[PDB]
Design a protein around this ligand. Structure first.
Ligand code: 6AT
Ligand code: OLC
Ligand code: OLC
Length: 389
């Protein structure tokens, strides 16, 4: 009512920071639209990112109206409170909702029209839901601005309008946390799968060590008993690695040629150990060592290089796209939603002190800037792809 807010810093710092976002964002979205609208909608991920790029556009279009209003209350600030600021929040939760759907879609592809119709109807669901939340926030901004200095939208809203403001901010907390928990669960399952794929590849490489290091002992061996002990250990290690299922041959049947090449590949190496085993059983040292050294030949070394390469962890396991989403959530959306509820409470009722209401506003405005940073960082999911370079 009689509270004074220090605008000496916010009128220089924030319009300058938002000029940078408006500049970068238009270049980023300019490149994103000419790349995404020139390609067809053959997958669900393309449809969701085609909707995210048009939502990012409306978010960037809001910034010039904020640059002028924060720099200077008047008819411009009244309009910002009524139209542009509401549009910013509308497209923000649209971007969050689609980011959650992109995380689910990309997670389902790591585990493996009617499929495309589902993605298209879910797009309509998000756009209609957020508009039905934003529309009353625009209409109910009806209260005469008595003073030309009091720059707060809560003071320009009616009794029912202030109630709808409190409801929407709670619904938006539910919208954020449902999408944020979706991104956490998906990421955890991917990271858990990466550990499971690592252990299986580590056990495969350990069998190769109890085949390479044991062969070095045979080269320095003197008695027939020392060669016979190492030959039995090498045969067991090669047999154990043959039974193993690598992460590359995960979605492959045991009757497939790819699975058969891996099984027979080890049998060629097992055979050479078995040939030297017959010589070692009799009591031969030089005759058994010559047959054991046949595993180091140009042809057999290629087989060892092939079987090791098949065992290796693929790039399909390392999901960079889901990690970009979780990083965007922690930097852009998490700090903002951790300061919205204490700020919304100071807006609904004049219960806080002048210094208390001011401190909450500066924290809200600073965190709101990081939320705006997502609009210039969201098309990077498209830029870090195979068909984008
Ligand atoms: C999906 S539509 C939506 N979602 C919100 N979370 C949301 N939060 C606030 N709004 C609406 O956006 C308008 C201004 O938001 P605001 O953050 O309360 O204004 P402000 O940052 O200038 O804070 P004050 O100076 O008003 O205290 C206002 O009409 C309000 O009803 C919102 N609209
Ligand atoms: C990242 C969060 C940075 C937000 C930190 C900015 C808070 C500024 C602030 O509220 O300090 C003003 C002082 O309390 C007078 O009211
Ligand atoms: C990230 C946003 C950039 C951080 C914005 C720094 C907060 C500066 C601010 O708004 O605090 C000024 C206040 O008037 C002091 O009394």
């Amino acid at each position: 009512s009689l509270c004074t807010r220090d605008y000496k810093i916010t009128q220089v710092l924030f319009p300058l920071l938002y000029t940078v976002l408006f500049f970068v964002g238009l270049i980023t979205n300019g490149l994103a639209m000419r790349i995404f609208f020139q390609i067809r909608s053959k997958s669900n991920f393309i449809i969701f990112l085609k909707n995210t790029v048009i939502s990012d556009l409306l978010m960037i279009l809001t910034f010039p109206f904020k640059i002028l209003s924060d720099a200077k209350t008047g008819p411009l600030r009244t309009f910002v409170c009524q139209v542009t600021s509401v549009i910013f929040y509308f497209t923000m939760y649209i971007s969050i909702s689609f980011l959650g759907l992109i995380t689910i879609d990309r997670y389902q592809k790591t585990t493996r029209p009617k499929n495309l119709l589902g993605a298209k109807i879910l797009s309509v669901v998000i756009w209609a839901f957020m508009f039905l939340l934003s529309l009353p926030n625009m209409i109910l901004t009806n209260r005469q601005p008595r003073d030309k200095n009091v720059k707060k939208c809560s003071f320009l809203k009616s009794e029912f309008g202030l109630v709808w403001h409190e409801i929407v901010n709670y619904i938006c907390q539910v919208i954020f946390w449902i999408n944020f928990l979706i991104v956490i669960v998906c990421y955890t399952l991917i990271t858990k799968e990466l550990y499971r794929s690592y252990v299986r590849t580590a056990d495969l490489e350990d069998n190769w060590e109890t085949l390479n290091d044991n062969l070095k002992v045979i080269e320095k061996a003197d008695n027939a008993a020392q060669v016979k002990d190492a030959l039995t250990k090498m045969r067991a290690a090669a047999l154990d690695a043959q039974k193993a299922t690598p992460p590359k041959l995960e979605d492959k049947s045991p009757d497939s040629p790819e699975m058969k090449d891996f099984r027979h590949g080890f049998d060629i190496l097992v055979g050479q150990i078995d040939d030297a085993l017959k010589l070692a059983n009799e009591g031969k040292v030089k005759e058994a060592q010559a047959a054991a050294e046949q595993l180091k030949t140009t042809r057999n070394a290629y087989i060892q290089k092939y079987l090791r390469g098949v065992g290796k962890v693929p790039r399909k396991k390392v999901n960079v796209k889901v990690f970009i989403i979780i990083a965007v959530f922690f930097i852009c959306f998490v700090p903002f939603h951790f300061a919205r509820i204490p700020y919304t409470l100071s807006q609904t009722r004049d219960v806080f002190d002048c210094t208390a209401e001011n401190t909450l506003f500066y924290v809200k405005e600073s965190t709101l800037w990081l939320t705006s940073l997502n609009a210039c960082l969201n098309p990077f999911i498209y830029f870090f792809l195979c068909k984008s370079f």
